[PDB]
Design an enzyme around this catalytic site. Structure first.
Site, mmCIF file in Angstrom:
data_model
loop_
_atom_site.group_PDB
_atom_site.id
_atom_site.type_symbol
_atom_site.label_atom_id
_atom_site.label_comp_id
_atom_site.label_asym_id
_atom_site.label_seq_id
_atom_site.Cartn_x
_atom_site.Cartn_y
_atom_site.Cartn_z
ATOM 1 N N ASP A 86 0.822 -1.207 0.000
ATOM 2 C CA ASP A 86 0.000 0.000 0.000
ATOM 3 C C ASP A 86 0.860 1.262 0.000
ATOM 4 O OD1 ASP A 86 -1.871 1.888 0.254
ATOM 5 O OD2 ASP A 86 -2.876 1.061 2.024
ATOM 6 N N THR A 87 1.000 1.865 -1.181
ATOM 7 C CA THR A 87 1.762 3.094 -1.318
ATOM 8 C C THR A 87 1.103 4.278 -0.628
ATOM 9 O OG1 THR A 87 0.703 3.699 -3.424
ATOM 10 C CG2 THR A 87 2.663 2.303 -3.517
ATOM 11 N N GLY A 88 -0.178 4.178 -0.290
ATOM 12 C CA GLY A 88 -0.864 5.216 0.442
ATOM 13 C C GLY A 88 -0.791 5.105 1.947
HETATM 14 C C1 LIG Z 1 -6.730 6.807 3.197
HETATM 15 C C2 LIG Z 1 -5.224 6.685 2.971
HETATM 16 C C3 LIG Z 1 -4.646 8.097 2.859
HETATM 17 C C4 LIG Z 1 -4.560 5.960 4.139
HETATM 18 N N1 LIG Z 1 -4.948 4.572 4.195
HETATM 19 C C5 LIG Z 1 -4.333 3.616 3.299
HETATM 20 C C6 LIG Z 1 -5.290 3.311 2.155
HETATM 21 O O1 LIG Z 1 -4.588 2.656 1.134
HETATM 22 C C7 LIG Z 1 -6.446 2.445 2.637
HETATM 23 C C8 LIG Z 1 -6.023 1.013 2.962
HETATM 24 C C9 LIG Z 1 -7.278 0.207 3.323
HETATM 25 C C10 LIG Z 1 -7.983 0.400 4.663
HETATM 26 C C11 LIG Z 1 -9.224 -0.408 4.996
HETATM 27 C C12 LIG Z 1 -9.783 -1.420 4.004
HETATM 28 C C13 LIG Z 1 -9.080 -1.613 2.671
HETATM 29 C C14 LIG Z 1 -7.835 -0.809 2.337
HETATM 30 N N2 LIG Z 1 -7.418 2.389 1.547
HETATM 31 C C15 LIG Z 1 -8.684 3.017 1.553
HETATM 32 O O2 LIG Z 1 -9.088 3.638 2.506
HETATM 33 O O3 LIG Z 1 -9.401 2.882 0.356
HETATM 34 C C16 LIG Z 1 -10.843 3.219 0.295
HETATM 35 C C17 LIG Z 1 -11.020 3.867 -0.761
HETATM 36 O O4 LIG Z 1 -11.082 2.753 -1.822
HETATM 37 C C18 LIG Z 1 -11.709 1.580 -1.091
HETATM 38 O O5 LIG Z 1 -10.774 0.251 -1.294
HETATM 39 C C19 LIG Z 1 -10.180 0.038 -0.148
HETATM 40 C C20 LIG Z 1 -11.099 0.649 0.885
HETATM 41 C C21 LIG Z 1 -11.733 1.878 0.126
HETATM 42 S S1 LIG Z 1 -5.274 3.953 5.743
HETATM 43 O O6 LIG Z 1 -5.585 2.514 5.666
HETATM 44 O O7 LIG Z 1 -6.370 4.629 6.400
HETATM 45 C C22 LIG Z 1 -3.723 4.187 6.595
HETATM 46 C C23 LIG Z 1 -2.628 3.159 6.505
HETATM 47 C C24 LIG Z 1 -1.337 3.458 7.233
HETATM 48 C C25 LIG Z 1 -1.190 4.772 8.017
HETATM 49 N N3 LIG Z 1 0.001 5.348 8.855
HETATM 50 C C26 LIG Z 1 -0.382 6.610 9.388
HETATM 51 S S2 LIG Z 1 -1.831 6.949 8.927
HETATM 52 C C27 LIG Z 1 -2.259 5.745 8.092
HETATM 53 C C28 LIG Z 1 -3.555 5.458 7.356
#
Ligand SMILES: CC(C)CN(C[C@@H](O)[C@H](Cc1ccccc1)NC(=O)O[C@H]1CO[C@H]2OCC[C@H]21)S(=O)(=O)c1ccc2ncsc2c1
Lengths: 99, 99
Positions: A25-27
């Site tokens: 997860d690059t995000g």
């Molecule tokens: C929102 C971003 C900026 C940050 N997130 C990472 C992001 O990739 C999340 C991963 C995920 C979380 C829960 C279920 C599946 C995937 N994806 C997400 O929300 O996707 C939305 C939109 O698409 C939909 O598919 C997937 C779910 C829907 S995180 O998880 O909240 C995070 C991680 C480390 C971390 N270290 C300090 S803060 C912090 C915050």
């Protein structure tokens, strides 16, 4: 390897003697793993995303093997719905985005 | 380009004729942008992240340019903490993970 993004980039990881599936997860700044009983000391932490925050336990210097690539760093453990490999470990296995 | 992950993979996007910063997020299925005005019809939907579920406005077939690469797809607009570019658009610009 090269991973396309048609489907979720799930790979096998080894942590604390257990095999699991986790998202590359690059995000994700940090690595967040589903609830598990790791030994050792930890510190409480809160991490926020879509929908708000969850409370996690922060463990430091935890060894993780990601697709045969070893890495060691901070791992957060809490009620996440999925195992998330974040940038702190992705850098260590030589992972890049390419387009 | 090849993007390392020692910093957040933040890039400039263009949507509705407006420039914004957004995060290339391989852990997101969908693209979710902070509150903004967008032309066209939309339908309310729900999406869940690490912290729970939020209400969002779903815009279909929206033109969006990411680092000069054009995409046309679904864009969700709502109270997300960060503009995120998800796999639905990352595939369109030809993005892959490599290590
Ligand atoms: C929102 C971003 C900026 C940050 N997130 C990472 C992001 O990739 C999340 C991963 C995920 C979380 C829960 C279920 C599946 C995937 N994806 C997400 O929300 O996707 C939305 C939109 O698409 C939909 O598919 C997937 C779910 C829907 S995180 O998880 O909240 C995070 C991680 C480390 C971390 N270290 C300090 S803060 C912090 C915050």
């Amino acid at each position: 390897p090269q991973i396309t993004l048609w489907k979720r980039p799930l790979v096998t990881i080894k942590i604390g003697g257990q095999l699991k599936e986790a998202l590359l997860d690059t995000g994700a700044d940090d690595t967040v793993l589903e609830e598990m009983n790791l030994p050792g000391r930890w510190k409480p932490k809160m991490i926020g995303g879509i929908g708000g925050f969850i409370k996690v336990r922060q463990y430091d210097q935890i060894l993780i093997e990601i697709c045969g690539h070893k890495a060691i760093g901070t791992v957060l453990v809490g009620p996440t719905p999925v195992n998330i490999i974040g940038r702190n470990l992705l850098t260590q296995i030589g992972c890049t985005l390419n387009f």
